[PDB]
């Protein structure tokens, strides 16, 4: 909340400094000076406010963010891959169950004793 | 170890089936309560020795089968346990050249 | 935590860029110190955008690790099935032996 607002203010100050450097000498250098000083003070504030919290994100998440993609991209691909994997193992298990049922029917056709013992198992 | 090619898988079925292979199945043989030495204590009974040499003993001298054909240990039994054209082939138990 | 360390590193990089802009404006030309300051400002803006992206990644959906753990469990189950097959293979090696 407040940290996001501080980051947005820092981005706005950076944009203003870039515009002042790109424009003309008329732009007050003292104005950009005070802006940089306030940005440093706000960064020290951004720090102090965020110095004891969270502690997570040990993932290539940074690589995906720096890989010209948002979680709305690389994270989506990872979730889709995980969903494909989980759907595939379910198909594996279902086909295994079908083959087991087929062989159970065949072994019931083979021996009546086996039919009785698998009925006891069930 | 991937295998699973339709051709690779098809070879497996033929090789496995070849080694393994209306009933035409051997006559069921039940309990044997009197064994010739320990069970009946009839060791050296002369009737038993005569029976093994010439008489048909269902399990000591041969396999009865169904349809009545009698197969001795030296002979090879051809039988068809599944209801299919393919027939199981018991090679001779003794195989004395 | 980690975002705090990233913000501290960004502040240190901004201080280094300010020192470099000082050196450029001091030994740099009038049309050179301004360009160096603009480049340092663009770098600082890129760092701030990266920090905002890091915050959005720390937020948004917090199930990425859950999905990764589910995929790891599925892979472990598949590896267990493969190990079962290899155990059957070594068992049949011992059998043919």
């Amino acid at each position: 909340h407040l940290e996001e607002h501080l980051e947005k203010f820092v981005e706005n100050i950076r944009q203003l400094g870039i515009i002042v450097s790109d424009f003309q000498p008329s732009s007050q250098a003292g104005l950009n000076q005070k802006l940089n000083f306030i940005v440093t003070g706000l960064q020290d504030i951004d720090k102090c406010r965020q110095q004891l919290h969270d502690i997570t994100v040990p993932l290539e998440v940074f690589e995906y963010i720096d890989q010209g993609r948002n979680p709305q991209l690389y994270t989506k691909e990872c979730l889709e891959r995980a969903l494909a994997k989980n759907e595939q193992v379910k198909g594996k298990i279902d086909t295994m169950k079908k083959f087991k049922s087929l062989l159970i029917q065949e072994l019931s056709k083979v021996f009546p004793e086996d039919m009785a013992k698998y009925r006891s198992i069930r | 170890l991937s295998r699973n090619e339709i051709i690779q898988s098809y070879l497996s079925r033929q090789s496995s089936l070849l080694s393994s292979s209306a009933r035409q199945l051997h006559v069921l043989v039940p309990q044997s309560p009197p064994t010739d030495l320990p069970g009946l204590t009839r060791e050296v009974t002369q009737d038993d020795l005569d029976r093994i040499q010439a008489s048909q003993w269902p399990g000591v001298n041969g396999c009865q089968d169904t349809q009545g054909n009698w197969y001795d240990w030296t002979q090879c039994i051809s039988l068809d346990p599944h209801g299919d054209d393919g027939r199981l082939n018991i090679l001779p138990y003794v195989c004395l050249d | 935590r980690l975002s705090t360390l990233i913000e501290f590193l960004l502040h240190r990089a901004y201080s280094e860029l300010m020192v470099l802009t000082d050196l450029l404006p001091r030994k740099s030309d009038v049309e050179r110190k301004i360009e160096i300051v603009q480049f340092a400002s663009r770098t600082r803006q890129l760092f701030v955008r990266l920090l905002a992206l890091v915050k959005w990644a720390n937020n948004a959906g917090k199930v990425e690790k859950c999905a990764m753990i589910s995929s790891f469990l599925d892979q472990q189950a598949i590896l267990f099935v493969d190990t079962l097959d290899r155990l059957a293979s070594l068992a049949r090696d011992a059998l043919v032996h």
């Binding site: 083959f99 | 497996s12 018991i90 001779p92 | 079962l84 097959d85 059957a88 068992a91 059998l95 043919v96």
Partner: peptide, 25 residues
Amino acid sequence: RLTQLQDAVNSLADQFCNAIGVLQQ
């Protein structure tokens, strides 16, 4: 005969193996 029986038992056990392998594949 007995060698055929041993080979048949081994092929039966392998049957399990190949079937499960195919399934996982």
